[PDB]
Amino acid sequence: PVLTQPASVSGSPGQSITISCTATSSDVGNYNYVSWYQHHPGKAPKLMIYEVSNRPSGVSNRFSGSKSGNTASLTISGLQAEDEADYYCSSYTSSSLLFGGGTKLTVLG
Amino acid sequence: NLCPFDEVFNATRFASVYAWNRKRISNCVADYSVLYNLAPFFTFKCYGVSPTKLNDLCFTNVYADSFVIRGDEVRQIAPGQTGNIADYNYKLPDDFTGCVIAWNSNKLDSKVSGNYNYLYRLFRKSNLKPFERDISTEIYQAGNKPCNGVAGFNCYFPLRSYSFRPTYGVGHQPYRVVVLSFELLHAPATVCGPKKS
Amino acid sequence: ITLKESGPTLVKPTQTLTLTCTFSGFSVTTSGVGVGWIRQPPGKALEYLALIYWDDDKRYSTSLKSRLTITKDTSKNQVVLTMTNMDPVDTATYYCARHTIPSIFDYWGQGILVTVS
Ligand SMILES: *[C@@H]1O[C@H](CO)[C@@H](O)[C@H](O)[C@H]1NC(C)=O
């Protein structure tokens, strides 16, 4: 019951990148409540995407997501120098809720 | 004097199916326009009356019966149906006239490790008659011996929990059901739609 | 919508940890709304600890259930988490956040760093 993420994602400014979060089991059931957080050092984690593809208000349209199979993906278009953060995925399990390993995003320049 | 459907459909708490809640609606103007935006509106079906012509008729006695069940049990709330809910928790008459409204309420009723506050009846001696309510929690005897309250063999506690969770697929998710029964006949009417004189 | 976290920053081994969360801008006494706690040990992923609902239902992480206790006080908008038998390895930044179904947590507080020594 471990959510798996890539340790690090890289890319050039202006292009699009994908951060994945893949389930390792079926304990997640419908796996239809996947949440993504943006964590900046020294700051509280911010909710970017919820319920797989929905955005909170106050969130740029550069952030979107979707599912295929039992894997969720966060897409960041127009990569900006201000997007450098640790991204986390979260979902539900049979008796609890879990967070992913965490992906470190680095922006070139 | 608008009719207070708000207290029926937008309530903060719903009753369990074994003890469904009823309240009388009267002396109001009832527009059915307002309750089409509660949800995707998964189910809405009427018996004896078209859903489109409700804002044209006037009724004598209107009652709203509310409760929470599983999605795949919604099909049992109809005339002529049988299974479990229809027989032991909430029975409709064969000549029922009224409308059944239901929607997916997973986002309100489910909990991380299961919501156990919703009960239904599993065991009973006989089937219910239309619109009866069985509240008793007395222990059911399934054998030839008086267990006298002891939940041993051939002896059961009548009620069980639904245990609703976010991870369940559709059909095991909670649905909120409201049944509006009508009485449309020659008697003096009290609840009319929004028309001018 | 704000949540603030207060309590001891320094704890010693075998002692008991206590943290108190103050919230405002909303009430917790509503359907589908609770308050939970998350911790993040240095260089590691976020770990779920405990969650309390509007009706006083209580949930805990499956590995820490025997150590965590959570209570609430709706008269002064407080949520209190305690954790017994603190170990030196239990050093982390703790967070208080609002809990809902469609979005697991939101409106996270700034967090409080607690060191065990
Ligand atoms: C319930 O509240 C929502 C949101 O304000 C509203 O759109 C809906 O019409 C209300 N339901 C009824 C029956 O008024």
Side-chain angles (χ1 to χ4, degrees), chain A residues 1-7 9 11 13-14 17-24 26-56 58-65 67-76 78-79 81 83-90 92-109, chain B residues 1-5 7-25 27-32 34-36 38-41 43-55 57-81 83-93 96-140 142-143 146-147 149 151-152 154-160 162-184 187-189 191-195 197, chain C residues 1-5 7-9 11 13 15-23 25-26 28 31-43 45-61 64 66-72 77-81 83 86-88 90-117:
Chain A
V2 179
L3 299 179
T4 299
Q5 295 186 283
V9 174
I17 61 170
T18 300
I19 301 167
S20 65
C21 181
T22 186
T24 197
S26 60
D27 289 345
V28 299
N30 62 38
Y31 190 63
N32 201 37
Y33 293 103
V34 181
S35 170
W36 291 88
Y37 298 95
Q38 182 180 46
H39 185 209
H40 286 272
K43 305 293 184 182
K46 180 177 177 178
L47 180 66
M48 299 304 285
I49 299 291
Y50 69 95
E51 204 169 347
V52 175
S53 62
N54 291 327
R55 291 153 56 206
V59 176
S60 172
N61 63 316
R62 295 187 298 109
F63 291 85
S64 67
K67 288 203 297 181
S68 64
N70 62 341
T71 300
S73 299
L74 175 68
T75 299
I76 302 171
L79 185 66
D83 291 331
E84 288 191 343
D86 293 342
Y87 288 86
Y88 295 90
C89 61
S90 175
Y92 291 117
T93 67
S94 295
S95 62
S96 64
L97 63 97
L98 302 175
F99 294 90
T103 300
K104 184 180 179 181
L105 171 61
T106 299
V107 180
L108 301 174
Chain B
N1 190 19
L2 295 174
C3 199
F5 283 126
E7 295 178 5
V8 176
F9 292 94
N10 276 0
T12 61
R13 184 176 178 184
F14 278 63
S16 68
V17 75
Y18 91 91
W20 47 275
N21 186 33
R22 166 177 285 192
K23 90 182 203 79
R24 185 166 66 89
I25 298 168
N27 197 35
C28 63
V29 56
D31 55 317
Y32 292 85
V34 175
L35 59 128
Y36 283 105
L38 302 171
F41 219 52
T43 296
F44 180 44
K45 293 179 179 179
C46 298
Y47 299 90
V49 61
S50 175
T52 299
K53 295 186 178 180
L54 290 169
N55 296 316
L57 302 181
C58 193
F59 307 99
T60 302
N61 290 301
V62 179
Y63 293 88
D65 295 346
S66 61
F67 48 88
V68 178
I69 59 172
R70 292 182 296 163
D72 66 3
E73 294 176 320
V74 171
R75 53 95 72 187
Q76 291 184 36
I77 295 91
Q81 296 293 61
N84 189 258
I85 298 302
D87 295 292
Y88 303 127
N89 293 272
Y90 182 74
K91 177 73 85 80
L92 295 176
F96 175 75
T97 174
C99 300
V100 179
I101 300 162
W103 62 99
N104 191 306
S105 57
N106 185 276
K107 293 177 182 178
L108 298 175
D109 295 308
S110 71
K111 293 182 181 176
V112 169
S113 187
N115 185 343
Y116 292 84
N117 289 334
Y118 291 110
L119 303 175
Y120 71 100
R121 184 176 297 276
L122 202 299
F123 295 96
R124 185 171 153 91
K125 183 176 178 181
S126 299
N127 296 332
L128 295 175
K129 296 180 178 69
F131 298 120
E132 287 188 318
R133 185 191 291 107
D134 189 13
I135 294 168
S136 174
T137 59
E138 292 294 322
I139 302 302
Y140 173 74
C147 63
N154 298 328
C155 182
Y156 304 92
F157 183 71
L159 308 178
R160 279 169 164 69
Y162 282 119
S163 68
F164 295 115
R165 280 187 279 274
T167 61
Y168 285 167
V170 158
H172 294 283
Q173 294 182 8
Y175 280 69
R176 288 176 176 197
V177 181
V178 177
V179 180
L180 302 176
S181 62
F182 300 144
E183 183 65 13
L184 300 176
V191 178
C192 299
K195 287 195 168 183
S197 61
Chain C
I1 306 299
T2 62
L3 292 95
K4 186 200 306 186
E5 301 169 47
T9 185
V11 201
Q15 185 64 60
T16 299
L17 179 146
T18 179
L19 296 170
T20 174
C21 181
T22 298
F23 64 90
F26 66 100
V28 76
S31 173
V33 178
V35 178
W37 293 82
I38 308 97
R39 70 174 185 176
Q40 186 176 22
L46 300 172
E47 181 181 5
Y48 167 70
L49 297 177
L51 170 66
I52 187 161
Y53 289 94
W54 72 94
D55 57 9
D56 211 41
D57 277 349
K58 300 169 187 170
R59 310 295 178 192
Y60 304 96
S61 176
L64 299 173
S66 73
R67 294 206 286 154
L68 300 172
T69 299
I70 188 164
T71 65
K72 67 174 170 61
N77 297 328
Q78 186 173 355
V79 179
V80 178
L81 177 70
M83 186 173 189
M86 292 301 294
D87 192 294
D90 288 331
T91 295
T93 300
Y94 290 78
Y95 297 93
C96 182
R98 193 179 78 100
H99 176 92
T100 59
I101 297 297
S103 58
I104 295 167
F105 294 110
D106 63 15
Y107 300 111
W108 293 57
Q110 67 188 316
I112 177 71
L113 175 64
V114 182
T115 299
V116 178
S117 179

